[PDB]
Design a protein around this ligand. Structure first.
Ligand SMILES: *[C@@H]1O[C@H](CO)[C@@H](O[C@@H]2O[C@H](CO)[C@@H](O[C@@H]3O[C@H](CO[C@H]4O[C@H](CO)[C@@H](O)[C@H](O[C@H]5O[C@H](CO)[C@@H](O)[C@H](O)[C@@H]5O)[C@@H]4O)[C@@H](O)[C@H](O[C@H]4O[C@H](CO)[C@@H](O)[C@H](O)[C@@H]4O)[C@@H]3O)[C@H](O)[C@H]2NC(C)=O)[C@H](O)[C@H]1NC(C)=O
Ligand SMILES: *[C@@H]1O[C@H](CO)[C@@H](O[C@@H]2O[C@H](CO)[C@@H](O)[C@H](O)[C@H]2NC(C)=O)[C@H](O)[C@H]1NC(C)=O
Ligand SMILES: *[C@@H]1O[C@H](CO)[C@@H](O[C@@H]2O[C@H](CO)[C@@H](O)[C@H](O)[C@H]2NC(C)=O)[C@H](O)[C@H]1NC(C)=O
Ligand SMILES: *[C@@H]1O[C@H](CO)[C@@H](O[C@@H]2O[C@H](CO)[C@@H](O)[C@H](O)[C@H]2NC(C)=O)[C@H](O)[C@H]1NC(C)=O
Ligand SMILES: *[C@@H]1O[C@H](CO)[C@@H](O[C@@H]2O[C@H](CO)[C@@H](O)[C@H](O)[C@H]2NC(C)=O)[C@H](O)[C@H]1NC(C)=O
Ligand SMILES: *[C@@H]1O[C@H](CO)[C@@H](O)[C@H](O)[C@H]1NC(C)=O
Ligand SMILES: *[C@H]1O[C@H](CO)[C@@H](O)[C@H](O)[C@H]1NC(C)=O
Lengths: 534, 482
């Protein structure tokens, strides 16, 4: 018979199947001509189609496809043999569907595969040997799936894999150092806690994990390294990446920065360290001569002035949100961008500083000052002959509020007092391990701890923090979703308006044919009127 | 009457008296009131004292309540003739005395307020080993015309000399050793001050305010945490003892201060030699160098580094100095015990037990309060944890869960939820990117079709104009032809 039969429509692509709809009950389908050899279109896609299951019938009848675009076709299952005859596919696009699993030898016969996108599906794992036969694979994306592990053999035969996207899965293990060809990779928004870095990758984004350990061979090509939002607590590992140009260590757990891990960086320009727990910084012992942007904002820096020899050499220096008391710049400094607000300035230090830098180079400002402070050049400052002594006293005064916080009748009492002293010791022991953990959670979430407040108040500080954080994240996601829906709407309206522009093109062709008939009919009449005039 | 009232001239002593018998005891002296010039109640189990019961003795000039078990308020404001009051070794908490007090012995108490009605004489006040936390804990009168003021072993943080201005002309001895003082402040000329003892406190800067003690013979800042000395200080030739051992000085200030108090340098040497036997302090590290007699060091910025070290503890991700600290706290408890000895009185075994009964009743009572604060803190936590598990969804717990375990499960769950939420958001952002790329593909196709229409619009217009030129030739011929 050949009852349901779908045919190409040359337009970018040389084959576009239209209005195809397969579901889970659908039994038999036919693509192109019966004579498989007339089906030699190389660049195939679908329009207005939805294929719950990708039929074996498609590349059974089309064995000459180079680029197969199955993006966003509600695919949920791939037929165990849909790719048995797919020898020629170089580029396979299957993003944005609902594929839950790949059949184990689904790519055993596409050995010229160079590009594969499976982003935004429901993969939970990869079958052993899934890529053992695509040695030519150069770009692979599986961002937005639910993967938990990439086993170590996964990429043993793909010795050209250059661009790997795994962003936004649930990954707790993946060893990139086993894929030495990597050129670009993104494993951001996973659950990693160690990051192995392969020998020659040049841009790597592993932000939003829980990394605390970085490892892998010295790699001199690594240029951009994004690690913002992790669990980093030391930086010595940096010594191994002498070629960095930018590194982002923001939203980590660093407590100090020293120059030692940077001494081998021949071309570092951009170093981001906002939002750690920096209490000290020494980048002056050996300055980084090439650096241009250094972001230290939102930490606990107090004394940074000896860093003058590094700061003088920067273009962009963000000190905001700290407790910096003094800062010192040469008349010859090169800053074009400087942030200074929200610290604890000494007025003498601010006045001398604003002899050498002025707004608009200083990019921010304070609004209101505490009781003994007043604005100079737009920032709060207190007058003092010995600012550091002063800050040391201020601090101690806040903490000391907390640091101020029948003789048978005699034998029965000594007993009573011992039994009570024991109940009281036991009470502290019993709730000890708990008080430890409350303090660990206030440190973890950067909450400030009121050494006055009763214990259930600190415990509420953690819970109130978590609940607010959940709510704000949820509202934010709702917003993003509202935005996606709105943008899908727009594309649905656009396609409707394109159909109407096409119907108009259709009417105008009909009008052109009519007019062309009317023209010849007049050309005729006028020829007749001329003979009748000899 | 198991109690005995011994008389010797006009000094009376009462023994084996108790709280329930003392009022009787005193009544049996009303006959003789004119003659009660000193009254000595020491070494009994008394725990309260009725100022009013003693007001008949209008000639009473000395009252010795030493080594009883007095608690709470001791109020004798009303005894206007009273001149010497000894209550060493009790547990008094607030103390009020009258307009005649010349000498006030109150060591080894629990004192944290003292009032002294206004008066004309000097006062010698002895308060070693109490709980004074600031000079204003003593009322204005308590600080007027003080000649000798011993506040050793109290709990003061900061001294403000101005608060002792009403003793500019009288104050000769000020002991503040073994407190917790980290700032001193105020300029006042103490015309008579012979000695000032700030040993074992926590001072970091000997500043301008020490011109107030420029006149002293004897001064100690031993065992503080000093780093800088104000150079403008000018001490008198009167100075003979000048102890600064146990600090951490930056040589800069030793040199700057010796430079215009040259004298003081040999005074420093002579002091360490009197006290230790060699002419320089034994620095904690031998590598370390003196300037004159005191260990010192060219320090980059000692105050900043101390503040940074504090801010590190405050902000460290995880929750040495526990050896510096613990031996500093033993130093204090050795001084307290030592002192509890230097003021100890003789007491008979039957009144010791009579005393230990009242004292144990107070310990028991305080312990009940504490054990019950404990119980309350505990139920508050359990309550809070039960509100918390009612707001999320925990995994199933096979075993009974402690509060530690509950807090760990709760945070863990919020962390799962946050991650879930973030993953959802990522998908939404990726969807917006996919549809936006689709929009640009579609809007390309929108211009391709809009331009094709524009061009059909034109081509219809051409073919029309051409149909019209033919229409004109048809009507020109037909005119010509019929
Ligand atoms: C590794 O893998 C992850 C994928 O997970 C990649 O992470 C993505 O990175 C980019 C950053 O490069 C992120 O996109 C940026 O988003 C910011 C944030 O904008 C949001 O908030 C703004 C501030 O209030 C607001 O303006 C935004 O609203 C805009 O966008 C929405 C889209 O819905 C729209 O409603 C509006 O019309 C707005 O335009 C938004 O809510 C954004 O500010 C960036 O802006 C673009 O334009 C600026 C203009 O100056 C330009 O300079 C930028 O280059 C940029 O094009 C930018 O879009 C992205 O959100 C992350 N995606 C995910 C999925 O998390 C990561 O980049 C990969 N790493 C590497 C190294 O490649
Ligand atoms: C950040 O890194 C530290 C160090 O690896 C993690 O703390 C360890 O993890 C648990 C208990 O917290 C145990 O495996 C170790 O005993 C911990 N080590 C230390 C030194 O505390 C910590 O959990 C990581 N933080 C996060 C949020 O993952
Ligand atoms: C109050 O009475 C006590 C004794 O209860 C007197 O204390 C004597 O103090 C001296 C030192 O001053 C010691 O040598 C004696 O041993 C103490 N006597 C006893 C029995 O211990 C105390 O001096 C009296 N106070 C006043 C002000 O007179
Ligand atoms: C010394 O003083 C403190 C405080 O003045 C005493 O504790 C107070 O006493 C009452 C009764 O026990 C309580 O209501 C308060 O809770 C206490 N305040 C504080 C801060 O604890 C303490 O008992 C006294 N010491 C002795 C041994 O008498
Ligand atoms: C094709 O061309 C002619 C000429 O412009 C159109 O005929 C009319 O032209 C006259 C003269 O200016 C006007 O009075 C009319 O407005 C025009 N319209 C009508 C209805 O006759 C003719 O209509 C054109 N055909 C089309 C639709 O393009
Ligand atoms: C896709 O096919 C269905 C069924 O004929 C149709 O109703 C829907 O709008 C189609 N989309 C387009 C743009 O043809
Ligand atoms: C640099 O600072 C901000 C952003 O970092 C920018 O607004 C500002 O105008 C730039 N600097 C100058 C000189 O204006």
């Amino acid at each position: 018979p050949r009852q349901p039969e779908y045919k190409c429509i040359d337009s970018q692509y040389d084959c576009v199947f239209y209005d195809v709809h397969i579901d889970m009950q659908t039994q038999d389908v036919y693509f192109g001509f019966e004579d498989i050899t007339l089906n030699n279109q190389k660049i195939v896609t679908f329009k207005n189609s939805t294929m719950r299951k990708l039929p074996a019938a498609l590349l059974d009848s089309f064995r000459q496809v180079e680029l197969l675009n199955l993006n966003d076709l509600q695919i949920e299952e791939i037929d165990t043999y849909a790719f048995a005859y797919a020898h020629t596919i170089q580029k396979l696009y299957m993003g944005f569907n609902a594929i839950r699993y790949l059949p184990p030898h689904v790519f055993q016969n596409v050995p010229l595969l160079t590009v594969l996108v499976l982003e935004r599906n429901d993969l939970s794992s990869l079958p052993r040997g899934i890529f053992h036969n695509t040695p030519k694979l150069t770009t692979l994306s599986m961002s937005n799936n639910n993967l938990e592990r990439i086993e170590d053999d996964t990429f043993q035969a793909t010795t050209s894999l250059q661009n790997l996207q795994l962003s936004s899965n649930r990954l707790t293990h993946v060893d990139l150092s086993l894929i030495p060809s990597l050129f670009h990779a993104n494993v951001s928004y996973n659950l990693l806690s160690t990051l192995a870095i392969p020998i020659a990758v040049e841009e790597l984004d592993a932000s939003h994990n829980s990394i605390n350990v970085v490892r892998g061979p010295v790699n001199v090509e690594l240029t951009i390294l994004k690690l913002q939002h992790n669990n980093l607590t030391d930086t010595a590992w940096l010594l191994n990446y002498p070629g960095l140009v930018e590194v982002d260590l923001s939203y980590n757990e660093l407590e100090k920065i020293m120059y030692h891990p940077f001494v081998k960086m021949q071309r570092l320009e951009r170093l981001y360290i906002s939002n750690n727990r920096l209490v000290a910084l020494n980048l002056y012992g050996q300055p980084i001569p090439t650096l241009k942007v250094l972001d230290l904002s939102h930490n606990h820096l107090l004394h940074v002035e000896r860093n003058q020899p590094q700061f003088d050499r920067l273009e962009n220096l963000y000190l905001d949100h700290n407790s910096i008391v003094t800062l010192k710049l040469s008349t010859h400094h090169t800053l074009k961008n400087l942030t200074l607000s929200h610290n604890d300035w000494d007025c003498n230090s601010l006045r001398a500083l604003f002899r050498n830098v002025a707004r608009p180079a200083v990019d921010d400002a304070d609004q209101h000052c505490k009781i003994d402070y007043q604005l100079e050049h737009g920032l709060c400052c207190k007058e003092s002959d010995k600012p550091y002594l002063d800050r040391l006293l201020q601090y101690i005064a806040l903490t000391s509020v907390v640091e101020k916080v029948l003789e048978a009748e005699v034998n029965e009492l000594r007993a009573e007092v011992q039994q009570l002293t024991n109940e009281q010791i036991q009470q502290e022991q019993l709730l000890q391990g708990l008080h430890a953990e409350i303090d660990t959670n206030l440190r973890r979430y950067r909450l400030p701890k009121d050494g006055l407040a009763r214990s259930s108040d600190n415990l509420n500080k953690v819970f109130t923090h978590l609940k607010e954080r959940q709510a704000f994240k949820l509202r934010e996601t709702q917003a993003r979703r509202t935005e996606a829906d709105a943008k899908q709407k727009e594309t649905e309206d656009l396609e409707q308006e394109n159909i109407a522009l096409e119907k108009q093109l259709d009417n105008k062709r009909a009008k052109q044919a009519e007019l062309r008939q009317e023209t010849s009919l007049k050309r005729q009449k006028v020829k007749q009127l001329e003979a009748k005039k000899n | 009457a198991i109690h005995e009232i011994k008389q010797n001239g006009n000094r009376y002593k009462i023994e084996k008296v108790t709280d329930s018998s003392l009022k009787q005891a005193l009544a049996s002296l009303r006959q003789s009131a004119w003659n009660v010039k000193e009254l000595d109640l020491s070494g009994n189990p008394l725990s309260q004292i009725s100022a009013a019961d003693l007001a008949p003795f209008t000639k009473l000039e000395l009252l010795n309540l030493s080594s009883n078990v007095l608690y709470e308020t001791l109020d004798l404001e009303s005894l206007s003739t009273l001149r010497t009051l000894d209550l060493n070794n009790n547990y008094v908490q607030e103390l009020l005395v009258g307009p005649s007090i010349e000498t006030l012995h109150a060591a080894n108490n629990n004192i944290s307020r003292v009032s002294c009605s206004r008066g004309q004489g000097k006062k010698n006040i002895y308060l070693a080993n109490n709980k004074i936390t600031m000079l204003r804990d003593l009322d204005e009168g308590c600080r007027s015309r003080v000649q000798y003021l011993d506040l050793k072993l109290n709990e003061i943080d900061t001294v403000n000399f101005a608060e002792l201005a009403a003793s500019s002309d009288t104050l000769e001895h000020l002991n503040l050793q073994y407190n917790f003082i980290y700032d001193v402040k105020g300029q006042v000329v103490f015309a008579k001050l012979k000695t000032l003892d700030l040993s074992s406190n926590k001072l970091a800067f000997m500043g301008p305010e020490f011109q107030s003690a420029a006149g002293v013979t004897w001064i100690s800042l031993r065992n503080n945490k000093l780093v800088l000395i104000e150079k403008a200080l000018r001490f008198s030739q009167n100075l003979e003892h000048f102890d600064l051992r146990g600090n951490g000085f930056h040589c800069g200030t030793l040199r700057d201060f010796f430079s215009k108090n040259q004298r003081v340098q040999t005074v420093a040497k002579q002091t360490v030699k009197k006290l230790t036997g060699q002419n320089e302090e034994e620095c904690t590290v031998p590598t370390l160098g003196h300037y004159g007699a005191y260990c010192c060091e060219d320090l980059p910025a000692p105050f900043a580094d101390r503040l940074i070290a504090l801010k590190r503890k405050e902000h460290a991700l995880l929750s040495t100095e526990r050896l510096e600290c613990e031996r500093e706290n033993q130093a204090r408890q050795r001084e307290i015990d030592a002192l509890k000895e230097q003021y100890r009185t003789v007491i008979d075994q039957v009144t010791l037990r009579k005393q230990a009964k009242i004292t144990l009743e107070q310990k028991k009572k305080a312990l009940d309060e504490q054990v019950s604060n404990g119980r309350r803190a505990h139920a508050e936590l359990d309550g809070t944890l039960q509100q918390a598990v009612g707001q999320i969804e925990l995994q199933h717990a096979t075993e009974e869960q402690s509060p530690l375990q509950l807090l760990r499960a709760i945070v863990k769950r919020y962390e799962e939820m946050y991650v879930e939420q973030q993953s959802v958001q990522n998908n939404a952002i990726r969807d917006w990117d996919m549809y936006q790329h689709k929009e640009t593909q579609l809007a390309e196709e929108n211009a391709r079709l809009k331009k094709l229409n524009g061009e059909a619009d034109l081509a219809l217009a051409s073919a029309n104009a051409t149909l019209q030129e033919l229409v004109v030739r048809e009507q020109n011929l037909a005119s010509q032809l019929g």
